[PDB]
Amino acid sequence: GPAYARLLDRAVRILAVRDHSEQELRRKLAAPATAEDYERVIAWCHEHGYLDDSRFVARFIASRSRKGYGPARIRQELNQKGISREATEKAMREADIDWAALARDQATRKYGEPLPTVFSEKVKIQRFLLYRGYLMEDIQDIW
């Protein structure tokens, strides 16, 4: 009906611009109609390719990993975006990204190559990589 069509126009205009998670789309539809009208719009967007959280999460992991963030931060950010843990874990497994190698790269960029090895400097390097979201397990072998 009228509410559905008005909300559909609003949704497509938002989504035509750039990728959103389904939850990001909801927040924007709710920013300045029945529950069924919202759901029907959502459903249309998925059917016509304007929403696809699996595509969204794969792209997000790729992008954030290239910017020097590790899994623990990426997972937190995805949760904020309303991506299911299921979608996140599948896309993580699929991306098969060598986090230890990317961490080593961030470290040499900030701290030089060969990496510092003195105890007090190594601790600072570990702190930096952990804050970036790399796992202790990722970090243990950069040396």
Helix (H, G, I), strand (E, B), or coil: what is residue 134? coil
83 CA to centre of own chain: 8
Are the beta carbons of 112 and 104 closer than 8 angstroms? no
| Resolution as reported, in Å | 1.8
DSSP H helices, 16-118, are 22-30, 35-47, 53-66, 71-80, 85-95, 99-111
Among the listed residues 74, 83, 29, the one whose alpha carbon sits nearest the alpha carbon of residue 56: 83
- Read off the DSSP letter of residue 94: H
Domains and CATH numbers, the chain: 1-51 (1.10.10.10), 52-97 (1.10.10.10), 98-143 (1.10.10.10)
The amino acid sitting at 102 is L
